[PDB]
C-alpha cells in the first residue's frame, strides 16, 4: 500500500492547496508554494499550468513572473523560459529585473544577436543610467570598437549627465581616437552650461589634455575663461590648476 499512501499524501496536499487557493484567489503565496511543491516532484507539466493560471488572477506582480521563469530556467527547458521571458518583458516593460535576468540568461548561453536584440529592445524604452552603461559594459566585455561606438551616441541625447559627458570621452581612454576624440571634446564643449560649465567638464578635459602634450591646453582652463562661475572655480583647485600646468611640459628656462 505504498502507492496508496503516496497518492494519499499527494492527493491530500493537492486538495489542501486547491482549497487554499479557492478561498483566497488574491494572495499569491499559495500559488508559488503549490507550484514549487509540484516542482519538487521534479517531473511536471502541471506546475507550468499552476503558474500559467496563477497570472490570470494577478499578472502585475514581479515575483510570480521571475519565479516561474527561474523555475523554467532552473531546468533544461530553455526554449520555454525564453518563450515566457519575452512575454514578461512585453507585458511589463518598466520593471528592470525581467530584462536583466533575460539578458543574463542569454549571456550564459551564446552571445547571439538575439541577446543584442533583447538589449536594444531594453534600450528602446529609455531606461536610466544603470541599464545603459550595463549594456556598454556588455559591449566592452565582448571587445567591440564598432558596436559600443554604435550604441553610445544614442545614449547621450537622453542622459546629458556630466558624469556621462565625461564618459562619452572614453574613446580617448581606450582607443585614443585622435581627431574624432577631439571631436568628442568639441561635442563636450558646445553643449549645456555655455557660460556656466557645470564646474566639472573641463577638469577631466584638462586631465586628458595634460595627459596630452601642449597642443592646445593653455586655452580651456585659462584663456577660454569667459565662462566662469563667479570665481572661475572654487578655491579647491586653482593653485592646483597652476601646479597642474607647471611641471608636465618642455620646461623652458
Amino acid at each position: 500500500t505504498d502507492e496508496e499512501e503516496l497518492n494519499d499524501y499527494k492527493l491530500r496536499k493537492r486538495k489542501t492547496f486547491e482549497d487554499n487557493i479557492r478561498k483566497n484567489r488574491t494572495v499569491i503565496s499559495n500559488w508559488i508554494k503549490y507550484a514549487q511543491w509540484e516542482e519538487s516532484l521534479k517531473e511536471i507539466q502541471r506546475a507550468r499550468s499552476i503558474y500559467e493560471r496563477a497570472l490570470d488572477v494577478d499578472y502585475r506582480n514581479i515575483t510570480l513572473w521571475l519565479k516561474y521563469a527561474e523555475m523554467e530556467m532552473k531546468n533544461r527547458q530553455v526554449n520555454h523560459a525564453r518563450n515566457i521571458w519575452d512575454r514578461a518583458i512585453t507585458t511589463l516593460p518598466r520593471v528592470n529585473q525581467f530584462w536583466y535576468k533575460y539578458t543574463y540568461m542569454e549571456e550564459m548561453l551564446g552571445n547571439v544577436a538575439g541577446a543584442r536584440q533583447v538589449f536594444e529592445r531594453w534600450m528602446e524604452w529609455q531606461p536610466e543610467e544603470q541599464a545603459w552603461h550595463s549594456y556598454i559594459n556588455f559591449e566592452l566585455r565582448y571587445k567591440e570598437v564598432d558596436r559600443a561606438r554604435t550604441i553610445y551616441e544614442r545614449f547621450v541625447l537622453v542622459h546629458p549627465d556630466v558624469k556621462n559627458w565625461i564618459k562619452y570621452a572614453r574613446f580617448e581612454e581606450k582607443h585614443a581616437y585622435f581627431a574624432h576624440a577631439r571631436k568628442v571634446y568639441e561635442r563636450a564643449v558646445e553643449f549645456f552650461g555655455d557660460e556656466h560649465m557645470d564646474e566639472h567638464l573641463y577638469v577631466a578635459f584638462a586631465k586628458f589634455e595634460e595627459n596630452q602634450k601642449e597642443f592646445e591646453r593653455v586655452r580651456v582652463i585659462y584663456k577660454y575663461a569667459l565662462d566662469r562661475i563667479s570665481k572661475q572655480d572654487a578655491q579647491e583647485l586653482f593653485k592646483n590648476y597652476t601646479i597642474f600646468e607647471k611641471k608636465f611640459g618642455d620646461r623652458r628656462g
Binding site: 526554449n79 518563450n83 519575452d86 512585453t90 536584440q117 529592445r121
Partner: peptide
C-alpha cells in the same frame, strides 16, 4: 512546431 512563429516585417525591425 514546439516554438512559436517568428515574424519580422518586410523592411523594419522585429515585430513583437
Amino acid at each position: 512546431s514546439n516554438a512559436l512563429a517568428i515574424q519580422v516585417d518586410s523592411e523594419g525591425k522585429i515585430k513583437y
